Amino acid sequence: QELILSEENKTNIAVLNLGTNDRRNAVLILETALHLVEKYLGKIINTSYLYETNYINELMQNLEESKYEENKELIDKCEEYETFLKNGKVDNSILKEVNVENYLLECNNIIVKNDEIYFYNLTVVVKTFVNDPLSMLVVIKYIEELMKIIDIDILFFNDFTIFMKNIKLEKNMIYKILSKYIHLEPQEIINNMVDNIEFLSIPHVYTTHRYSILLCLNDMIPEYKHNVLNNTIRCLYNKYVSRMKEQYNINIKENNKRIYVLKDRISYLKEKTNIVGILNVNVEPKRAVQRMFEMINEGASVIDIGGEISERDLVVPVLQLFQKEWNDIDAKPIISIDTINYNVFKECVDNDLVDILNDISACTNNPEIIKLLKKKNKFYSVVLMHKRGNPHTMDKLTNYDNLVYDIKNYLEQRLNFLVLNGIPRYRILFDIGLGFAKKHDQSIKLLQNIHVYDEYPLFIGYSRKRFIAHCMNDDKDQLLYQKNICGGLAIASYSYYKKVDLIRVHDVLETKSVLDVLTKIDQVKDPNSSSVDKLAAALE
Amino acid sequence: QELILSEENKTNIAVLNLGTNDRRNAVLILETALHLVEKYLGKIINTSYLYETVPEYIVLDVNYINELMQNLEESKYEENKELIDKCEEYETFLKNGKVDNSILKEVNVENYLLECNNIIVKNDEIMKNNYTSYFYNLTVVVKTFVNDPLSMLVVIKYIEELMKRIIDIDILFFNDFTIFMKNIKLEKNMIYKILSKYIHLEQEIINNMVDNIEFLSIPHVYTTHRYSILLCLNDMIPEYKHNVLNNTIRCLYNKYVSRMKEQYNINIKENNKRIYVLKDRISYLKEKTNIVGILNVNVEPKRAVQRMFEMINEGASVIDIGGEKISERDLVVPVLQLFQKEWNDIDAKPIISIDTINYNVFKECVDNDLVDILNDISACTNNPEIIKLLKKKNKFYSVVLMHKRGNPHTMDKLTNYDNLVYDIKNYLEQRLNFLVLNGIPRYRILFDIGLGFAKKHDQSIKLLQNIHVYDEYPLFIGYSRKRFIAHCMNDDKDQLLYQKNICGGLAIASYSYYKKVDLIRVHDVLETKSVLDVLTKIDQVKD
Ligand SMILES: Nc1ncnc2c1ncn2[C@@H]1O[C@H](COP(=O)(O)OP(=O)(O)OP(=O)(O)O)[C@@H](O)[C@H]1O
Ligand SMILES: Nc1nc2c(c(=O)[nH]1)N=C(CNc1ccc(S(=O)(=O)Nc3nccs3)cc1)CN2
Ligand SMILES: Nc1nc2c(c(=O)[nH]1)N=C(CNc1ccc(S(=O)(=O)Nc3nccs3)cc1)CN2
Ligand SMILES: Nc1nc2c(c(=O)[nH]1)N=C(CO)CN2
Ligand SMILES: [Ca+2]
Ligand SMILES: [Ca+2]
Ligand SMILES: [Mg+2]
Ligand SMILES: [Mg+2]
Ligand SMILES: [Mg+2]
Beta partners for B529?
A: none
Within a domain: B3? no
Amino acid at B453: F
Pairing of strands A50-52, A12-19: unpaired
Binding residues of A for Mg(2+), by number, are 144, 151, 153, 507, 510
3-class SS at A189? helix
- The closest ligand to the CA of B172 turns out to be 1
A41 Cβ contact list (under 8 Å, min separation 6): A14, A126, A128, A129, A130, A136, A139
- Identify any residues that bridge with A18 across adjacent strands, giving them in sequence order: A152
- DSSP letter at A367 equals G
In angstroms, rounded to a whole number, what is the distance separating the alpha carbons of residues A462 and A442? 13
The residue among B324, B336, B343 whose CA lies nearest residue B300 is B336
Using alpha carbons, list the distances in angstroms from residue B522 to B286, B463, B478: 19, 18, 7
In a shared domain, residues B333 and B454:
yes
**Are A240 and A193 contained in the same domain?**
yes
Cross-chain Cβ contact B507/A486 below 8 Å: no
Contacts (Cβ under 8 Å, ≥6 apart) of B193: B2, B5
Residue A101, Cβ density class (10 Å: 0-12 exposed, 13-18 middle, ≥19 buried): exposed
Which of A237, A258, A279 terminates a domain? The answer is: A258
Tell me how far apart the alpha carbons of residues A207 and A156 are, in angstroms, rounded to a whole number: 10
Distance of CA A12 to the CA centre of its chain: 24
* B354 φ/ψ angles, rounded to the nearest 5 degrees: -105, 120
Closest CA to A353 of A326, A377, A376: A326
Interrupted after residues, chain A (C–N over 2.5 Å) = 53, 117, 148, 185, 282, 308, 329, 474
CA distance linking residue B289 with residue B516, whole number of Å: 6
**Cβ atoms of A203 and A104 closer than 8 Å:** no
Nearest-CA distance from B461 to chain A in Å? 6
Residues B286 and B247 in one domain: no
Task: Give the closest of B426, B468, B488 to A516, CB-based.
Answer: B488
Helix axes A285-298, A508-522, angle to 10 degrees: 10
CB A93 within 8 A of CB A135: no
How far apart (Å, rounded) are the C-alpha atoms in residues A65 and A43?
16
* Residue A396 in domain: yes
Does B422 sit within 8 Å of A521, measured CB to CB?
no
Contact B22, B137 (CB under 8 A): no
Residues B312 and B254 in one domain: no
**Is B288 found in the same domain as B268?**
no
B194 and B307 share one domain: no
Three-state DSSP state, A224: coil
Q: Final residue of a domain: which of B275, B294, B319?
A: B275
Say how many C-beta atoms besides its own lie within 10 A of residue B437's C-beta. Answer: 20
- Does B503 sit within 8 Å of A471, measured CB to CB? no
Domain match, A286 and A212 both: no
Residue nearest to atom 16 of ligand 2 (CA): A465
Please compute, for residue A471, the number of CA atoms within 13 A of its CA located in the half-sphere on the CB side: 32
What letter does residue B247 receive in the DSSP assignment?
S
| Residue B272 alpha carbon, nearest atom of ligand 4 | 1
The secondary structure element, H or E, covering residue B190 is helix B188-198
Full domain range(s) for residue A133: 2-258
Inter-chain touch A518–B534, beta carbons under 8 Å: no
Looking at chain B, how many residues does it have? 543
B116 domain residue, yes or no: yes
What does each C-alpha distance from B269 to B227, B258, B475 come to in angstroms? 10, 11, 19
Query: Solved by what technique?
Result: X-ray
Ligand-binding annotation for B214, yes or no, is yes
* CA gap B390, B440 in Å, rounded: 7
Ramachandran quadrant class, B96 (left: phi over 0; alpha: psi -120 to 50; beta: rest): left
Q: Are B239 and B299 contained in the same domain?
A: no
Q: Which residues does ligand 1 sit against, CB inside 6 Å?
A: B 153, 168, 170-171, 212-218, 220, 222
CA-based nearest residue to A490, from A470, B167, B56, A270: A470
Query: CA B177 → CA B109, B185, B242, B244, distances in Å?
Result: 11, 21, 9, 9
Three-class secondary structure assignment of B263-312: CCCCCCCCCCEEEECCCCCCEECCCCCEEEEEEECCCCHHHHHHHHHHHH
The helix or strand, by DSSP H or E, that contains position B420, with its residue range, turns out to be helix B420-437
SS3 call for B343: helix
Q: Do A489 and B507 touch (CB under 8 A)?
A: yes
Does B295 lie in the same domain as B253? Answer: no
- B489 CB neighbours in chain A (<8 A) are 513, 516-517
Q: Identify the CATH number of the domain in which residue A187 sits.
A: 3.30.70.560
Whether A263 is in a domain gets the answer no
- Residues of A with Cβ-Cβ distance to B527 under 8 angstroms: 482, 486
Is A301 in the B-facing interface, judged by CB distances under 8 Å?
no
Write the DSSP symbol of residue B183: S
The answer to whether residues A210 and A237 touch, using CB atoms and an 8 Å cutoff, is: no
Mutate to test the pocket of ligand 2, among A360, A398, A442 (most ligand atoms within 8 A of CB): A360
A471 near B CB under 8 A: yes
Of B275, B304, B327, the domain-final residue: B275
Please tell me if residue B489 touches chain A, with a CB cutoff of 8 Å. yes
Report whether B90 contacts B45 (CB < 8 A).
Answer: yes
Return the closest-CA partner of residue A451 out of A404, A490, A487, A403: A404
Cα–Cα distance, A23 to A266 (Å, whole number):
8
Cβ neighbours of residue B121 closer than 8 Å, sequence gap 6 or more: none
Q: A146-156 as b/e, with b when 16 or more CB fall inside 10 Å?
A: ebeebebbbbb
| Cis amide prior to A203 (ω within 30 degrees) | yes
Please check whether residue B397 lies inside any domain of the structure.
yes
Cβ B11 vs Cβ B41: under 8 Å = no
B380 phi/psi in degrees, rounded to 5: 55, 25
Distance A430 CA to ligand 2 centre (A): 15
Q: How many Cα neighbours within 13 Å face the side chain of A71?
A: 15
- What are the CA-CA distances from residue B402 to residues B126, B346, B378, B445 (Å)? 50, 33, 6, 11
Phi/psi at A401 (5° precision): -70, -45
CA quadruple A296, A299, A300, A301: dihedral positive or negative? positive
Q: Is the peptide bond before B219 cis (omega within 30 degrees of 0)?
A: yes
Instruction: Please name the amino acid found at residue B154.
Output: V
Kindly state whether residues B89 and B212 are assigned to the same domain.
yes
B510 Cβ under 8 Å from any chain A Cβ: yes
Question: Are the C-beta atoms of residues B527 and B504 closer than 8 Å to each other?
Answer: no
CB A508 within 8 A of CB A296: no
Q: Cα dihedral angle (B361, B364, B369, B375), rounded to 10 degrees?
A: 20
Q: Which of B453, B464, B481, B502 to mutate to test the pocket of ligand 3 (most atoms within 8 A of CB)?
A: B453
Determine whether the interchain pair A493/B535 forms a contact, defined as Cβ–Cβ distance below 8 Å: yes
Sign of the torsion angle spanned by Cα atoms B359, B361, B363, B365: negative
Question: How close does chain A come to B425, measured CA to CA in Å?
Answer: 10
User: Which parts of A are annotated binding residues for ATP?
Assistant: 141, 153-154, 196-199, 201, 204, 206, 210
| Greatest Cα pair distance in chain A | 86
| Contact state of B511 with A493 under an 8 Å Cβ cutoff | yes
Residue B463 belongs to domain with CATH number: 3.20.20.20
Q: Which positions ≥6 away from A70 have C-beta within 8 Å? A: A38, A39
- Chains A, B: CB contacts under 8 A, how many? 121
Q: How far, in Å, CA of B97 to CA of A217, rounded?
A: 72
- DSSP code for A392: T
Among B278, B292, B277, B287, residue whose Cα is nearest residue B520: B292
Q: Concatenated DSSP letters for A398-432?
A: ---SSHHHHHHHHHHHHHHHHHHTT--GGGEEEE-
Residue A266 domain flag: no
Which residue's alpha carbon is nearest to atom 14 within ligand 2?
A465
Nearest to residue B497, comparing CAs of B513, B481, B512? B481
Q: How far apart are CA B194 and CA B152, in angstroms?
A: 9
Q: What are phi and psi of B166, to 5 degrees?
A: -70, -55
Same-domain pairing of B152 and B84: yes
DSSP H or E run through B44 = strand B42-47
Q: What size, in residues, is chain A? A: 540
Q: Are A94 and A131 in contact (CB under 8 A)?
A: yes
Mutate to test the interface with A, among B418, B467, B479, B503 (most CBs of A within 10 A): B503
Q: Are A192 and A145 in contact (CB under 8 A)?
A: yes
Nearest beta carbon to residue A521 from set B315, B511, B530: B511
Contact B465 A515 (CB under 8 A): no
Q: CA torsion, points A132, A138, A141, A143, in degrees to nearest 10?
A: -90
Is the separation of the CB atoms in B45 and B437 below 8 Å? Answer: yes
How many whole angstroms separate alpha carbon A239 and alpha carbon A254? 16
Is position A527 within any domain?
Answer: no
CA distance A84 to B263: 53
* Pairing assessment for the beta strands B290-296 and A274-280 based on DSSP bridges: unpaired
Domain count, chain B: 2
DSSP state of A268: B
DSSP B433-484: HHHHHTT--GGGEEEE--TTSS--HHHHHHHHHTGGGGTTS-BEE--TT-HH
Locate the ligand 4 atom nearest the alpha carbon of residue B19 and give its number: 7
CA A86, chain centre distance (Å): 25
Determine whether A276 is exposed, middle or buried from the number of CB atoms within 10 Å of its CB (0-12, 13-18, 19+): buried
Cβ contacts of B540 on chain A, cutoff 8 Å: 444
Measured distance CA(A174)–CA(B511) in Å, rounded: 64
CA distances from A90 to A10, A84, A85, A99, A159 (A): 11, 9, 12, 17, 9
Question: Pick from A447, A493, A521: which is nearest to B465 by CB?
Answer: A521
Q: Buried b vs exposed e over B274-310: b needs ≥16 C-beta within 10 Å?
A: bbbbbbeebbebbebbbbbbbbebeeebeebbebbee
Measured from the Cβ of residue B245, the count of other Cβ atoms closer than 10 Å reads: 16
Candidates B456, B497, B531: best to mutate against A (most CBs of A within 10 A) is B531
Task: Give domain status of residue A163, yes or no.
Answer: yes
How far is CA B541 from each of CA A401, A454, A531, B52, rounded to the nearest angstrom?
18, 19, 33, 24
Q: State how far the Cα of A475 lies from the Cα of A144, in Å rounded to an integer.
A: 67
- Cβ contact (<8 Å) for B534 and A491? yes
- Please give the Cα distance from A373 to B502 (Å, whole number): 42
Interface with B, mutate which of A500, A511, A520, A526 (most B CBs under 10 A): A520
Angle at A179 between CA A174 and CA A182, to 5 degrees: 115
Alpha-carbon distance B283 to B273, whole Å? 10
CA separation for the pair A398, A442 (Å, rounded): 9
- Same-domain pairing of A219 and A365: no
Contact B148, B104 (CB under 8 A): yes
Residue B25 burial (10 A CB sphere; 0-12, 13-18, 19+): middle
